[PDB]
Design an enzyme around this catalytic site. Structure first.
Site, PDB file in Angstrom:
ATOM      1  N   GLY A  55      43.583  24.028  11.818  1.00 16.45           N
ATOM      2  CA  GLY A  55      42.790  24.461  10.443  1.00 16.45           C
ATOM      3  C   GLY A  55      41.390  24.209  10.519  1.00 16.45           C
ATOM      4  O   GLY A  55      40.867  24.239   9.304  1.00 16.45           O
ATOM      5  N   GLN A  56      40.788  24.183  11.500  1.00 16.99           N
ATOM      6  CA  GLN A  56      39.156  24.052  11.527  1.00 16.99           C
ATOM      7  C   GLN A  56      38.733  25.489  10.726  1.00 16.99           C
ATOM      8  O   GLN A  56      39.582  26.292  10.590  1.00 16.99           O
ATOM      9  CB  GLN A  56      38.616  24.376  12.929  1.00 16.99           C
ATOM     10  N   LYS A  57      37.398  25.213  10.008  1.00 19.12           N
ATOM     11  CA  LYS A  57      37.063  26.426   9.617  1.00 19.12           C
ATOM     12  C   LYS A  57      36.947  27.662  10.183  1.00 19.12           C
ATOM     13  O   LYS A  57      37.753  28.720   9.792  1.00 19.12           O
ATOM     14  CB  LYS A  57      35.493  26.311   8.984  1.00 19.12           C
TER      15      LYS A  57
END
Ligand SMILES: Nc1nc2c(ncn2[C@@H]2O[C@H](COP(=O)(O)OP(=O)(O)O)[C@@H](O)[C@H]2O)c(=O)[nH]1
Ligand SMILES: [Mg+2]
Lengths: 165, 142
Positions: A55-57
């Site tokens: 889910g990191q940017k």
């Protein structure tokens, strides 16, 4: 047939810990997911393919490459991270209007309920505007991925709803 | 050609970091092989406790990296006893993120002197029909 469950959420929400905890594996050496983590297993007679995508940017832009044929969407939220609760809301609502995710059952895991400042389920229900959701069956389930508390209640409901379609 | 050049980039950027075997019931790793699983001149092998032959449920996990993006990635894993098939798994990943590290795990449901040294786990990774990598691990129980 096998069921495909897609687990998304902001980085640090606890997606990977929930998956390992759920499968009875150690969750003390968990690091950030820089791609996907897929578990194929059986639960209550169902054969599941669970996709935990980072889910990191930088990784969210790729989330859409895994929408096809998703039966259930598991949205994990860090109940104690009130800060990104607004970004969390926007990401979720964005997902709910995706064509390749229409009809998919939605399970919201308000994770980290073992933490002091963990917002209630009602609070998260409001902050994420779940009541306006109407294109998807949904249920919010408070839980703790570290202790494993209430993970099954959430998953079990999700499978029962999906099967009824 | 550009196509051949791109496929060489794909192959060159792929790497199988590690593979392990767990007792599904307990979630305890019985064996995990790391260091250069797809390096030449080496008959990759695994010394796993023979008690695994008594497990009704075994999970097998793989962790791989890809510098290059891939669109139709998949794996084919077959476990043989000489020529006979003990297991065969297939899995379509599809999209693989550039510069990503990924994991895949499946929950898998004769003596030991006859098996040991004669069991091979062959994993093949493809991007549509381009063979990206092949892995062979000979098993030895205890
Ligand atoms: N106290 C507490 N910590 C959690 C919980 N779930 C995950 N964590 C911790 O939060 C961090 C990120 O978790 P992780 O599963 O890797 O997050 P992911 O980014 O969403 O995959 C790690 O330090 C975890 O140990 C929880 O329910 N309670
Ligand atoms: Mg993760």
């Amino acid at each position: 047939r096998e069921l495909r469950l897609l687990m998304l959420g902001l980085d640090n929400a606890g997606k990977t810990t929930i998956l390992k905890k759920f499968n009875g594996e150690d969750v003390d050496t968990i690091s950030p997911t820089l791609g996907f983590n897929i578990k194929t297993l059986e639960h209550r007679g169902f054969k599941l393919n669970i996709w935990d995508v980072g889910g990191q940017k930088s990784l969210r832009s790729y989330w859409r490459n895994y929408f096809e044929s998703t039966d259930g969407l598991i949205w994990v939220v860090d109940s104690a991270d009130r800060q990104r609760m607004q970004d969390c809301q926007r990401e979720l609502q964005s997902l709910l209007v995706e064509e390749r995710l229409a009809g998919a059952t939605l399970l919201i895991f308000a994770n980290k309920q073992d933490l002091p400042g963990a917002l209630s389920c009602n609070a998260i229900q409001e902050a994420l505007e779940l009541d306006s959701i109407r294109s998807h069956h949904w249920r919010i389930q408070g839980c703790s991925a570290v202790t494993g508390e209430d993970l099954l209640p959430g998953i079990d409901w999700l499978l029962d709803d999906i099967s009824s379609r | 050609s550009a196509k051949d050049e791109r496929a060489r980039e794909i192959l060159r950027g792929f790497k199988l970091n590690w593979m392990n075997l767990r007792d599904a019931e307990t979630g305890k790793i019985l064996w995990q092989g790391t260091e250069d699983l797809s390096v030449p001149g080496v008959e990759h092998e695994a010394r796993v406790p023979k008690k695994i032959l008594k497990c009704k449920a075994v999970s097998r996990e793989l962790n791989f990296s890809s510098t290059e993006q891939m669109e139709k990635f998949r794996l084919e894993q077959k476990v043989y006893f000489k020529g006979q098939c003990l297991e065969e798994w297939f899995f379509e990943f599809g999209f693989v993120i550039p510069n990503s590290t990924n994991t895949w795990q499946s929950l898998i449901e004769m003596p030991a002197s006859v098996l040991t040294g004669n069991v091979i786990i062959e994993t093949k990774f493809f991007d549509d029909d381009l063979l990206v990598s092949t892995s062979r691990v000979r098993l030895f129980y205890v």
